[PDB]
Amino acid sequence: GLQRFRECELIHGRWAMLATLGALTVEGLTGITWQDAGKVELIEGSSYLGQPLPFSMTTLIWIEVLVIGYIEFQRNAELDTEKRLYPGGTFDPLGLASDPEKKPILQLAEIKHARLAMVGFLGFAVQAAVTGKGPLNNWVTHLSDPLHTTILDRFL
Numbered sequence: 536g537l538q539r540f541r542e543c544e545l546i547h548g549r550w551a552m553l554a555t556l557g558a559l560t561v562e563g564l565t566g567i568t569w570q571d572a573g574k575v576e577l578i579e580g581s582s583y584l585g586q587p588l589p590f591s592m593t594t595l596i597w598i599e600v601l602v603i604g605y606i607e608f609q610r611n612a613e614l615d616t617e618k619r620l621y622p623g624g625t626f627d628p629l630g631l632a633s634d635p636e637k638k639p640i641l642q643l644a645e646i647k648h649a650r651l652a653m654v655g656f657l658g659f660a661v662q663a664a665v666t667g668k669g670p671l672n673n674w675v676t677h678l679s680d681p682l683h684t685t686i687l688d689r690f691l
């Protein structure tokens with residue numbers, strides 16, 4: 536459908552925004568890449584910024600399935616098509632998007648950032664399969680030497 540696509544788009548976009556930022560922050564602070572994060576979290580303890588966290592891989596997913604499930608449902612429990620995209624309310628404490636004249640601008644920025652992130656995460660992904668290294672690394676690598684770190688060195 537259509538309206539549904541407007542949801543699909545913004546939703547994936549909001550995830551893609553947190554993800555990308557997330558992938559970079561973890562590599563920049565713990566040295567662990569986003570692709571390995573799963574394995575090292577499973578093999579070594581559950582942790583965040585080095586510190587250890589009790590939860591096992593098991594009680595870990597139970598909590599996820601139950602907690603994201605519950606919320607994904609509550610969200611789906613509303614067909615006011617215009618809130619299925621801009622729920623507002625508790626989701627807008629500061630009330631930045633309260634004023635109707637500002638709304639369109641803010642929504643334009645949000646959709647651009649969201650489309651941008653998705654694109655970038657797509658990159659993040661392909662860049663992992665191809666280089667076996669993290670995004671933050673490829674980036675500081677291409678910067679250290681712009682000419683000899685392109686994707687042409689692969690074929691050449």
Ligand code: CHL
Nearest residue numbers: 546549550606609610611613618619620622623624625626
């Ligand atoms: C019951 C608890 C509940 C909680 C904890 C969450 C939590 C979350 N939701 Mg969900 N939701 C919840 C209820 C509902 N959601 C939605 C509709 C949405 C939408 C449409 C979206 C989310 C998204 C998200 C995330 C982003 C929050 C943010 O934007 O930062 C700013 C805000 C804060 C730091 C405060 C945290 C929120 C919390 C206290 C909300 C509790 C809601 C209620 C009081 C009930 C509804 C009445 C409201 C409108 C007054 C976050 C994981 C987004 C997502 O999935 O990202 C990809 C997204 O796009 N939720 C509806 C209405 C249809 C709900 C109804 O009960």
Ligand code: CHL
Nearest residue numbers: 569570571572573574575576577578592595596599600603
């Ligand atoms: C939502 C998106 C999501 C995505 C795109 C990935 C992507 C990835 N995970 Mg991952 N995960 C995701 C969510 C989660 N993961 C994990 C736990 C793990 C672990 C423990 C490991 C990965 C690994 C991997 C990688 C290899 C998959 C493969 O085919 O190699 C072949 C397969 C494997 C090596 C075994 C891993 C199976 C894996 C795909 C996990 C299944 C998780 C689920 C999506 C389901 C649970 C939650 C429900 C609520 C959605 C890849 C980078 C592995 C990695 O680090 O290697 C590079 C790894 O060791 N993930 C949890 C649990 C809390 C998740 C929750 O949603």
Ligand code: CLA
Nearest residue numbers: 550553554556557560561564565567572573582583584585
């Ligand atoms: C899709 C979103 C997403 C997802 C699924 C994950 C998933 C994961 N992350 Mg990532 N991460 C994200 C977003 C996400 N992250 C973002 C947006 C950031 C930036 C702050 C990070 C930063 C981050 C770090 C630094 C680390 C992880 C780690 C982890 C692992 C779990 C630990 C945990 O949940 O502790 C539960 C959560 C917490 C203890 C609370 C986090 C604090 C919140 C509330 C942040 C508020 C941010 C604020 C201070 C910054 C604003 C700046 C602005 C003014 C400029 C797991 C692989 C750890 C790992 O070892 O991975 C391998 C790890 O060390 N992530």
Ligand code: CLA
Nearest residue numbers: 539542543544546547550599600601603604605607608611
């Ligand atoms: C645990 C329970 C749970 C529950 C109750 C729901 C329920 C819902 N979600 Mg949610 N979601 C969850 C967890 C959950 N989600 C988690 C943990 C995430 C990851 C952050 C998401 C991310 C998410 C997104 C991004 C979207 C939804 C959407 C939806 C709705 C439709 C589901 C569907 O039919 O697609 C089932 C379909 C598939 C599994 C097909 C896969 C998609 C393909 C084309 C892409 C292949 C790419 C690849 C990178 C995927 C990852 C694989 C990986 C394991 C390696 C529904 C309200 C959709 C929505 O709101 O629609 C308008 C939507 O767009 N959810």
Ligand code: CLA
Nearest residue numbers: 654655657658661662665666673674676677684685686687
């Ligand atoms: C959308 C933003 C984006 C950005 C900022 C980057 C940035 C980078 N990529 Mg890349 N990448 C992207 C998307 C992106 N990628 C996507 C969607 C894919 C899949 C087709 C890939 C696949 C890819 C591979 C397989 C490799 C890189 C690599 C690199 C780095 C070096 C130069 C190179 O050869 O790129 C080649 C670029 C492409 C195939 C990208 C296609 C689309 C771009 C040109 C359009 C976006 C415009 C952009 C220039 C500016 C907007 C960004 C904004 C932040 C300013 C550099 C850090 C290399 C690396 O990691 O080495 C250090 C590498 O080997 N990229």
Ligand code: CLA
Nearest residue numbers: 549552553621622623624626627631632641642644645648
């Ligand atoms: C920069 C991209 C961006 C932008 C411009 C917007 C713009 C808009 N959004 Mg979002 N939104 C985004 C990303 C973005 N959003 C992401 C990633 C999520 C997922 C958390 C959402 C989820 C979301 C919901 C659910 C709602 C909105 C709403 C709104 C409106 C009001 C608030 C505002 O103006 O903030 C403008 C942006 C900024 C000032 C930048 C923020 C600086 C932050 C704190 C730094 C990074 C944080 C990080 C490290 C981790 C936090 C994660 C989390 C789980 C809380 C406006 C149309 C509300 C609406 O439509 O109400 C009327 C609403 O209810 N959006």
Ligand code: CLA
Nearest residue numbers: 636639640641642643644645646647648649650651652654
């Ligand atoms: C290279 C140049 C370039 C240029 C010029 C711009 C310019 C702009 N970008 Mg883009 N962008 C670029 C490249 C560029 N970008 C690239 C390559 C990317 C990477 C993919 C992006 C990604 C991007 C994102 C992700 C975002 C932008 C946004 C914006 C806008 C800034 C804020 C705004 O809209 O005003 C806001 C308005 C006001 C302060 C005033 C109110 C409105 C008035 C009435 C109209 C304005 C004109 C008026 C005064 C003049 C006519 C009067 C006449 C009757 C006499 C701006 C139009 C942002 C946006 O769209 O947010 C809104 C945003 O979030 N850009």
Ligand SMILES: CC(/C=C/C=C(C)/C=C/[C@@]12O[C@]1(C)C[C@@H](O)CC2(C)C)=C\C=C\C=C(C)\C=C\C=C(C)\C=C\[C@@]12O[C@]1(C)C[C@@H](O)CC2(C)C
Nearest residue numbers: 547548550551553554557558569570572573653654656657
């Ligand atoms: C949601 C998304 C990514 C989400 C990622 C998440 C949650 C990641 C989570 C984690 O990583 C962290 C943070 C930390 C790690 O340690 C662990 C995990 C758990 C792995 C990507 C979407 C990515 C979405 C993409 C790339 C979408 C591309 C769409 C295209 C090209 C559309 C094209 C067209 O629509 C036009 C423009 C016009 C038309 O005429 C027709 C067509 C042709 C259809």
Ligand SMILES: CC(=C/C=C/C(C)=C/C=C/C=C(C)/C=C/C=C(\C)C=C=C1C(C)(C)C[C@H](O)C[C@@]1(C)O)/C=C/[C@@]12O[C@]1(C)C[C@@H](O)CC2(C)C
Nearest residue numbers: 550553554556557560561583584599601602603605606609
């Ligand atoms: C994707 C995501 C989702 C979080 C969801 C949460 C927190 C849901 C809570 C969801 C919470 C829910 C539903 C709570 C429900 C509580 C209720 C009913 C309890 C109660 C009651 C009442 C009211 C009856 C009243 C009675 O008098 C008392 C009592 C006590 O009995 C988080 C991602 C990240 O954390 C990572 C992974 C890594 C980080 O770096 C960054 C970010 C991005 C932040």
Ligand SMILES: CC1=C[C@H](O)CC(C)(C)[C@H]1/C=C/C(C)=C/C=C/C(C)=C/C=C/C=C(C)/C=C/C=C(C)/C=C/C1=C(C)C[C@H](O)CC1(C)C
Nearest residue numbers: 552626627628629630631648651652655658659670673674
């Ligand atoms: C709602 C509300 C409410 C109330 O009222 C108020 C408030 C609080 C204000 C609000 C909130 C908000 C928020 C939270 C937000 C967030 C955001 C984000 C995160 C973004 C991102 C965003 C993001 C984005 C764009 C991104 C992008 C990305 C990209 C391009 C990338 C690229 C790349 C790649 C590929 C690769 C290589 O290697 C390198 C690089 C270069 C790295």
Ligand SMILES: O=P(O)(O)OC[C@H](O)CO
Nearest residue numbers: 643644645646647648651
């Ligand atoms: O679409 P933006 O946000 O990249 O802006 C493009 C400029 O308007 C071109 O003049």
